[PDB]
Amino acid sequence: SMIFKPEELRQALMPTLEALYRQDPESLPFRQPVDPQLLGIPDYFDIVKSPMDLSTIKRKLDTGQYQEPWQYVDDIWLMFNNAWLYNRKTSRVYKYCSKLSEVFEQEIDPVMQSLG
């Protein structure tokens, strides 16, 4: 119920978002919505029911669609859990995801503390 100003959400969370984008090659599979046809994985939507990626998250931050920062956390973990569900433990994407998730856990905590 406590509502955060959309511009306070941007200044606080956008550095945490840049931290994942800057991971290269690990972030590349995550920067745009998964396109099953274009990638040749047409079973993707039979398995992933709520897709999510960095461009959608950033667009929500840019346009003030999050009311409080834990919705941002939600979308980021949903993005990770989607990739861990779909790709096999031995795939590059799966390990790319784990890297991104290590980057996120190491930097989100002081940011969420400052937001109160």
Ligand X SMILES: Cc1cc(N2CCOCC2)cc2[nH]c(-c3c(NC[C@@H](O)c4cccc(Cl)c4)cc[nH]c3=O)nc12
Closest CA to 80 of 46, 44, 61, 54: 54
The two structure tokens encoding residue 29: 């599979």
- Of 9-17, 19-27, 32-40, 100-108, the segment contacting ligand X by CB under 6 A is 100-108
Which of 7, 43, 46, 109 touches ligand X (CB under 6 A)?
109
Task: Judge whether 93 and 29 are in contact, CB under 8 Å.
Answer: yes
Task: Judge whether 96 and 21 are in contact, CB under 8 Å.
Answer: no
CB 97, min distance to ligand X, A: 8
- Of 16-24, 29-37, 55-63, 107-115, the segment contacting ligand X by CB under 6 A is 107-115
Q: Does 81 bind ligand X (CB under 6 A)?
A: yes
d(CA 9, CA 25): 27
- Of 6-14, 15-23, 43-51, 98-106, the segment contacting ligand X by CB under 6 A is 98-106
